[PDB]
Design a protein around this ligand. Sequence first.
Ligand SMILES: Cc1cccc2c(=O)nc(CSc3ncccn3)[nH]c12
Lengths: 191, 198
Amino acid sequence: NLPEHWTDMNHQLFCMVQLEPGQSEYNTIKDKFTRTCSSYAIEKIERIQNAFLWQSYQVKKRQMDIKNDHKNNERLLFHGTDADSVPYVNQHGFNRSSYGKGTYFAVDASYSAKDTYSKPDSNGRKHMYVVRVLTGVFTKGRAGLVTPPPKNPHNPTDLFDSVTNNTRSPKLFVVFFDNQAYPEYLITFTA
Amino acid sequence: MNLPEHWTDMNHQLFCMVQLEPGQSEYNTIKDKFTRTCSSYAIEKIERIQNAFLWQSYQVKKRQMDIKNDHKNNERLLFHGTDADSVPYVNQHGFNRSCAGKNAVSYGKGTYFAVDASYSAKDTYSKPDSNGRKHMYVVRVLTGVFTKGRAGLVTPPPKNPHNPTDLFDSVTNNTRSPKLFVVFFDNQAYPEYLITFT
Ligand SMILES: Cc1cccc2c(=O)nc(CSc3ncccn3)[nH]c12
């Protein structure tokens, strides 16, 4: 039940796999990066293969495509982070524990790349994820949120799937639930 | 879908509240576990929570936790007292540690479940509504391997500090005779019943 472009895992559950620079995979992901980051240089890109994380995101993808219509739920966003969170993110993905109390993802790589988010290690090396997020139906964000707003406040059961800063042209995305985002690649880059 | 064979036909709907008959095995059992520690109260009704999406995502982790842990009994049956305003979201969307109320003696920021119904029947947790009712959930909780908790936790503590990202599944007030349990992740507990009592 896994992605068929994944490396054999030798009967293991977690695996980090570095891309070969000439590949279409490397250039597809790199072309997405170089749209808004032409200045930076990539040390590497690695495909994160997490069986359990994959499994649970997959489950929600279907629960979402069910619930909306079959709307276009999924987006490719970026998550810059500091070198020390990475081991956890690789393993357990993103955790929520201002447009809300949740996990932030950038439409553009230039945004995530801000040293505020993608923090240089002692070696000047920064980090950013290319994350598949289940965005589905969203609305505008505000400071207070612990969960996305319910569509109709007179039915506080159905919720939006995320929140944006502006709905006409969103530049970020916030999700408030475990397993709504699968980190697909890890870009290590340099000034 | 995955749906259990004892569930009422939801006829193509994803969430259902179903009223149990007292005479039934299912109703009496639940009853007998409530009356172990709670006699002075009385049961108005017992509803089975039939939530597909919750049941589905929950089960996936029950399996991932049966694999990952060497032949352990990962799943435990506990109580959750809550209030009239918190029933609807939960029935629909389960438990959320970010909405979690603080505990008198706190062992971690997350959602607390009780071994005895008495503790959960405290008006502190199960608050009576304007009609005087009290509500408690009967939850399937994945406790797995657990250590003692501390008030500073956000996720469980790691098994080996030198191996940080490897964590316990939950934490208890006491490992010898646990009376409470704390879980730190979505889909780690199934709200299987809603007891409304007095
Ligand atoms: C922190 C804690 C310890 C032991 C039990 C509970 C509980 O049953 N419900 C809750 C939910 S918080 C709440 N919810 C509604 C009314 C009062 N408090 N918390 C517990």
